[PDB]
């Protein structure tokens, strides 16, 4: 079972200049809760944005180039990434844009953070038909001292 987890601003913006154009410690907490002790598949741009391994998860990096960090697992293809996860209940695909594009069709589950922010972006979450998806869980949160935007945590299931 392949799952995507992503945080979407207004207009499906997920990124700008190899970072997320916001600062939502509550989102990173949600991300950590839902990824801990599961394999994570990320693209090389995302790996470099994060800048260090994600503790409690097998870190699988997609890159056509040879690896540059002995602590994580490097793969050269989707099929290799997926085999590198092994026999697990849930594969977590954690970004970015190009990687989401490739796994969304294989994905059974979406973990979305809807962020109330109209921010400039160079990377967007892939388009998809919502007819194909059923909302399972949502949870709304007001902005606070540490989170300048309101947000909603939603889980969706294919059909
Ligand atoms: N809002 C959110 O939830 C999140 C936001 N982001 C944002 O996403 C953006 C980055 O996304 P994007 O630019 O698409 O890049 P990605 O992070 O998806 O990484 C792309 C790179 O991954 C490698 N790669 C991807 N697919 C393959 C494949 N099939 N075979 C081999 N190598 C592959 C390549 O590395 P190489 O070039 O070395 O071959 C490619 O250049 C950033 O702005 C980041 O902040 C990311 C995570 C979460
Ligand atoms: C833990 O820190 C990061 C995590 C992520 C991935 C990510 C973050 N939030 C959500 N909701 N989904 C994701 N896939 C992406 C990041 O930057 C691109 C991070 O660095 C701040
Ligand atoms: Cl690519």
Author numbering: 1 to 159
Give passages from the manuscript:
TMP mediates its anti-bacterial effect by targeting bacterial dihydrofolate reductase (DHFR), a ubiquitous enzyme found in all organisms and thus also an important target for cancer and autoimmune disorders. DHFR catalyzes the reduction of 5,6-dihydrofolic acid (DHF) to 5,6,7,8-tetrahydrofolic acid (THF) by enantiospecific hydride transfer from NADPH cofactor. THF and its derivatives are essential precursors for the biosynthesis of DNA bases and amino acids.
To gain greater mechanistic insight, we next characterized the atomic structures of wild-type DHFR (DHFRWT) and mutant DHFR with an L28R replacement (DHFRL28R) using X-ray crystallography. Both DHFRWT (resolution 1.9 Å) and DHFRL28R (resolution 2.1 Å) were individually co-crystalized with the cofactor NADPH and inhibitor TMP. Distances between the amino acid residues of the enzyme and TMP (black values are for DHFRWT and magenta values are for DHFRL28R) indicated that there are only subtle differences between these two structures, particularly around the enzyme’s active site. Consequently, we recognized that the 2,4-diamino pyrimidine group of the drug can equally bind to the active site of both DHFRWT and DHFRL28R, and should not be altered when designing an L28R-specific DHFR inhibitor.
